Task: structure prediction
Amino acid sequence: FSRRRIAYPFYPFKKLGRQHPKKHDTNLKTAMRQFLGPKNYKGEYVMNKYFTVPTNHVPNYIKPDLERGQSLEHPVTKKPLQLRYDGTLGPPPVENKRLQNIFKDRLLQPFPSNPHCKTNYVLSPQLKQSIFEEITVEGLSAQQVSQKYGLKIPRVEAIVKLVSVENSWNRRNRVSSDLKTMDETLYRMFPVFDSDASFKRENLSEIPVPQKTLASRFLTIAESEPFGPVDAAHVLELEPAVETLRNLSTVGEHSSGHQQSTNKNTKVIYGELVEGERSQYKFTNAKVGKVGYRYGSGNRDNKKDRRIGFNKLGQMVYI
Amino acid sequence: SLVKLANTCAHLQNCSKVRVALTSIPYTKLQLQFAYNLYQQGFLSSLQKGSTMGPDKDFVEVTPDNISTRRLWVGLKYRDNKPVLSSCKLISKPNSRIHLPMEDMKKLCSGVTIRNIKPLQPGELILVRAHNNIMDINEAISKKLDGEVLCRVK
Amino acid sequence: ATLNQIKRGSGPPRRKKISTAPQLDQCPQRKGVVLRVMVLKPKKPNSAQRKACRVRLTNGNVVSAYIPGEGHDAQEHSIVYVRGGRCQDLPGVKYHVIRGAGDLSGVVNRISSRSKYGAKKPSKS
Amino acid sequence: KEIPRYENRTIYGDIDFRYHGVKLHLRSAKPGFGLRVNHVIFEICECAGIKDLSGKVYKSRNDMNIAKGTIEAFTKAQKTLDEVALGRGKKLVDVRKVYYSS
Amino acid sequence: DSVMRKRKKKMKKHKLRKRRKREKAERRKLSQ
RNA sequence: AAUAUGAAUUAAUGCGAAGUUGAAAUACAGUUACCGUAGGGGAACCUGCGGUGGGCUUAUAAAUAUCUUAAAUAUUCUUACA
RNA sequence: UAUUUUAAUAGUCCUGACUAAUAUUUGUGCCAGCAGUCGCGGUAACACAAAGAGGGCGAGCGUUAAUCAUAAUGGUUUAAAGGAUCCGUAGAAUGAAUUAUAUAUUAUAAUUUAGAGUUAAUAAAAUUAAUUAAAGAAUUAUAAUAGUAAAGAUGAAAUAAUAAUAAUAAUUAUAAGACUAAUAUAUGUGAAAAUAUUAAUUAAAUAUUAACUGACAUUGAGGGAUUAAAACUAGAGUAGCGAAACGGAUUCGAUACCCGUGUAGUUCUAGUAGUAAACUAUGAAUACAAUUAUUUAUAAUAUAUAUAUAAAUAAUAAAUGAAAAUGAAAGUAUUCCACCUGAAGAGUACGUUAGCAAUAAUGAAACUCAAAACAAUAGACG
RNA sequence: UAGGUAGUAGGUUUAUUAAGAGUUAAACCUAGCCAACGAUCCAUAAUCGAUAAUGAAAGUUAGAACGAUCACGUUGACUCUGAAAUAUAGUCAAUAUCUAUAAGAUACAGCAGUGAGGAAUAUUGGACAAUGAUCGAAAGAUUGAUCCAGUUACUUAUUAGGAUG
Ligand SMILES: [Mg+2]
Ligand SMILES: [Mg+2]
Ligand SMILES: [Mg+2]
Ligand SMILES: [Mg+2]
Ligand SMILES: [Mg+2]
Ligand SMILES: [Mg+2]
Ligand SMILES: [Mg+2]
Ligand SMILES: [Mg+2]
Ligand SMILES: [Mg+2]
Ligand SMILES: [Mg+2]
Ligand SMILES: [Mg+2]
Ligand SMILES: [Mg+2]
Ligand SMILES: [Mg+2]
Ligand SMILES: [Mg+2]
Ligand SMILES: [Mg+2]
Ligand SMILES: [Mg+2]
Ligand SMILES: [Mg+2]
Ligand SMILES: [Mg+2]
Ligand SMILES: [Mg+2]
Ligand SMILES: [Mg+2]
Ligand SMILES: [Mg+2]
Ligand SMILES: [Mg+2]
Ligand SMILES: [Mg+2]
Ligand SMILES: [Mg+2]
Ligand SMILES: [Mg+2]
Ligand SMILES: [Mg+2]
Ligand SMILES: [Mg+2]
Ligand SMILES: [Mg+2]
Ligand SMILES: [Mg+2]
Ligand SMILES: [Mg+2]
Ligand SMILES: [Mg+2]
Ligand SMILES: [Mg+2]
Ligand SMILES: [Mg+2]
Ligand SMILES: [Mg+2]
Ligand SMILES: [Mg+2]
Ligand SMILES: [Mg+2]
Ligand SMILES: [Mg+2]
Ligand SMILES: [Mg+2]
Ligand SMILES: [Mg+2]
Ligand SMILES: [Mg+2]
Ligand SMILES: [Mg+2]
Ligand SMILES: [Mg+2]
Ligand SMILES: [Mg+2]
Ligand SMILES: [Mg+2]
Ligand SMILES: [Mg+2]
Ligand SMILES: [Mg+2]
Ligand SMILES: [Mg+2]
Ligand SMILES: [Mg+2]
Ligand SMILES: [Mg+2]
Ligand SMILES: [Mg+2]
Ligand SMILES: [Mg+2]
Ligand SMILES: [Mg+2]
Ligand SMILES: [Mg+2]
Ligand SMILES: [Mg+2]
Ligand SMILES: [Mg+2]
Ligand SMILES: [Mg+2]
Ligand SMILES: [Mg+2]
Ligand SMILES: [Mg+2]
Ligand SMILES: [Mg+2]
Ligand SMILES: [Mg+2]
Result:
């Protein structure tokens, strides 16, 4: 049974009834007015608890289920307010116990209907500075920094690169007071990342799932026969999982055991340059049958899957 | 002989359904190898030589004078009111023999379909006849040998 | 069926796809001349006075067509463009005339589903 | 009833069970495959806790017969690994589980 | 089949028999 | 020689309501229906010879009955006589 | 103490279900009309034509014409569909055991006997086909003896036969055609069609044992033979039954059902044709699977009918099935052949082949439709 | 479409070609060869991909576009050059048009364009600037190949205003 249903709030609200013919209002509009509260001369809905932004490092996300739609609170006393018969506002007759105690997971969950989404932790400026120094000044490996602080190798590389950008923007004295206000405001909006705490730390034993390990296999062997992860690797013809974890640990730019000297054995000739020439030629050896444009290739220009790419300057080029 | 093998497969099916404990199948090298592979993999309680009337307790020498009256005697198992040997059926029929290369055997065990042969299910084994020897498909892959897929027994 | 019979031809029957517009000769539409305009009675249980036109296509085969809409200017020696489609109630007619093509004008004062019947969009801007 | 599920996600192996005039062909699925089955079976699975499956219904497609057949197939057509191992006297190992183990 | 289609076929056979009986003269003339 | 296009007047067949003439089938359909075949009749149909049940399996009485301790004993007995 | 100006007008289809679209209202009233399928409209139109509101796609939207996909991880007792039956050729169809070689699921050689056959001995049967030779009771016709006025049929009468010899009925004599009573279950035999009055000649058929052979086997396109009743061509016969025909009946009519006369046919010899509800509506073969009851055959343990093995029948377990039901299969499997792909058109038209002929075999397409069909359930009806 | 074939199947020699071959010409023999797993005959069609569409896939469809192959340049036959032509050559035969009336010339399946046919498919455009091709010692000359632009929503892609209200 499917029917068009106007998205009336699930929580109860006062519904307009006998009204002057020259009002032309709707139950949805009055629901919003009840939820927002009065709009002052400045255009600010001070009553609504979500108008402001938290400064206590605890996110203030919507909890419609727990507060039964009562989104109005005193700006200073931070106590619930609800509409009465007289049309004024004041303390509720009873206290809502669900709002009293909220699990930390719910605190970090922004959307009520999706319990699989959580907001990451903002790293403190001190931690970023320490990571920068240890990578650069102390000349350590990003693997070590990841292991101590629990962050990922891409994250620590991003930390160092962003800190370098911040330093460059700083020695030019370009960052204005507005950006500092922005950072201060947003810094207190999300929880800080405590390397000491285990449950904030991010797991570093994460491996992409190969397509073959997602396919179920079963072997019937002597019960006594011991079967281990290495035998599984042999039968699945994949590198052992621990070995794959070790391999990805060395792919970081600052991680130990990294080398990208594979493509240093191709004959490349740079043509001579004379005065007045606006260009120079590079000649790279390429074996016949492996170089050139195919004859009779596919023409996807007029099809939905046409290839579209970008050049160095960023212009959209039909690759 | 694929006809005899198909007959034995149907016979084992029927006996398991009516839930008998002892059964007789012809005397042949193919049947003996097939039964003993089943016995190793755990589908038969006991395999025994014997005549048409019953298994032979003592050693007996098989001669042309008594070759006709020889039948292997197999013992089926049951557990938790469910026969262990539920279904057993041929793959390579007598009219359409199937000879798969080793790579196709590996593909079959992996999960893909080759020659409209359903892949290897859990608790299943495909017997393969290579060089006059019957063995599990995994053993053939490990041994690198090649041959015809014979039957599935679940 | 034995596999010997399958190799001899036996197998699943290919789903027959009979054309519902044979006289169009695999063409979206064809011109024609209205040899006659007739009103026919629908088969039971429907009852009406349906307007149909007998049209001779350019191939050289005469087909029956149904003029849709409310009010048509079809008449003898009228050039019309016949398309596919069948008027289900009338038994025998298996084609439609495209309103707005040829000398067959569109439906007058048609304001909904115009393109299906032929009508310029009134601007009123 | 109680339905045995492989890793609380999918059935064990493939099922080709027949209910009266309904030919149920069901085959297991990869993690994250989704219920790519007929709507009747999809509802039965979603209520029973099965998340990944794939199959096709042949011959009769009566909804009620399909629902009865699929429930029965889950109940008795399939067999758990432990039961096979015990009645077989052999050891069945999940390569996927033992590849990602410690 | 049932007696429905059996009745239908019987009538068709009877009509064919009568039609071929009436056209005996024409058949003879056309076949010399 | 093959093929295609017409051809006076004429044989089937489909389609829409639609009246006329009977009542051939479905019940024992008022003569059991149908298969093969021959003859007859405005039309269904009727008749003749064999075959089938896709109708009778729908099947449901001629009938006769006996002796051992009738209890001071079996009938009671709730873990002990044995 | 600045460093040009500056905006933004989407169409198209649909909102009963399949199919997303509830905010209601007006016009017509089986008309106008819509429609891919079901279908809507005859005063409740959510379906026609519109307003409000809404749902898709979007510089495109719709419609037409087309391609792919959407079920054979199928069927043939009762729904489409096993050939009438068997014999057998090809089969690039299938098919025993052990060992040794190779180029390996195949071949070659040797050996073996479980499939398949040949011959003897022992025991039981008088069935099937052909050809001869006989028996039985009747029915009709004719004649005689007596013997009367009615006899025959029907729900009841008349058509045809009686006191003109004089019937009908009874008892005798003669001729003819046809058929086969219990037995009797077509039991049974036979490849099917068929097959029961008796005897004879020829041919075939069962079980056990001995020996022999050595996979020589199964199925079988094409092909070949036989094939009920009716039908046709010659020649004999025609008692009784009996298409057609002619009369008598009932009915409003009666080209019928009932009655009379009754030609072809029905009968034998030689032929043609090869068709049936030719049905177990169920092709043949092989291996296997749980019980019961009754008959038949074999085996000496016997003491004088208990014990084991085969086949048929009947009722079932499991299994299968849409169910009714099948239950040495319509179950579990393998091999071979025939056939089916919606109804109507249509086993029709045309062509070809064969027949003396009636006809038999082969065998389309066009137009129309969303129908058509089986099992079972509950009523109503007889 | 149930029988077909008569240089037909084969053998021996000679003749042309660089060459075998009843491929062609000549002589003598044998009596064969294809065929119900479909001959001979008839009708239809340009063929294919590492191309396009679709499907989970085996497959099914198209052969527009990119590429590969074949055949043709109004129709049929023959001839010289060559290694190769039955050549868009020529001869001859056939058809239609034109002027020069002649063993005359042309045949838009080269580009642009016109009439018809059709539901339907474009400019009688610019340059040899780039890549090629031809001639020339070279300077250079030509190139409707080719590179560009115009018509067309035929197809694909991007954009076609955000915050606040
Ligand atoms: Mg809806
Ligand atoms: Mg349904
Ligand atoms: Mg049938
Ligand atoms: Mg005819
Ligand atoms: Mg004539
Ligand atoms: Mg005419
Ligand atoms: Mg009647
Ligand atoms: Mg009747
Ligand atoms: Mg009559
Ligand atoms: Mg019969
Ligand atoms: Mg009846
Ligand atoms: Mg009955
Ligand atoms: Mg019965
Ligand atoms: Mg409309
Ligand atoms: Mg109204
Ligand atoms: Mg609609
Ligand atoms: Mg409307
Ligand atoms: Mg509107
Ligand atoms: Mg809109
Ligand atoms: Mg398919
Ligand atoms: Mg069968
Ligand atoms: Mg039969
Ligand atoms: Mg039949
Ligand atoms: Mg024998
Ligand atoms: Mg008398
Ligand atoms: Mg008798
Ligand atoms: Mg019998
Ligand atoms: Mg038989
Ligand atoms: Mg041998
Ligand atoms: Mg045979
Ligand atoms: Mg035959
Ligand atoms: Mg008879
Ligand atoms: Mg005669
Ligand atoms: Mg009579
Ligand atoms: Mg009579
Ligand atoms: Mg004959
Ligand atoms: Mg027949
Ligand atoms: Mg049962
Ligand atoms: Mg079955
Ligand atoms: Mg069936
Ligand atoms: Mg016929
Ligand atoms: Mg309808
Ligand atoms: Mg019924
Ligand atoms: Mg009643
Ligand atoms: Mg030669
Ligand atoms: Mg020659
Ligand atoms: Mg010659
Ligand atoms: Mg042919
Ligand atoms: Mg062509
Ligand atoms: Mg192709
Ligand atoms: Mg093609
Ligand atoms: Mg091309
Ligand atoms: Mg040429
Ligand atoms: Mg031309
Ligand atoms: Mg030429
Ligand atoms: Mg020329
Ligand atoms: Mg041109
Ligand atoms: Mg166009
Ligand atoms: Mg150039
Ligand atoms: Mg676009």
Observations:
- The two ends of chain D are 35 Å apart (CA to CA).
- Chains D and C do not touch (no CB pair under 8 Å).
- The longest helix of chain D spans residues 63-77.
- The domain at 15-94 of chain D is CATH 3.30.230.10 (Ribosomal Protein S5; domain 2).
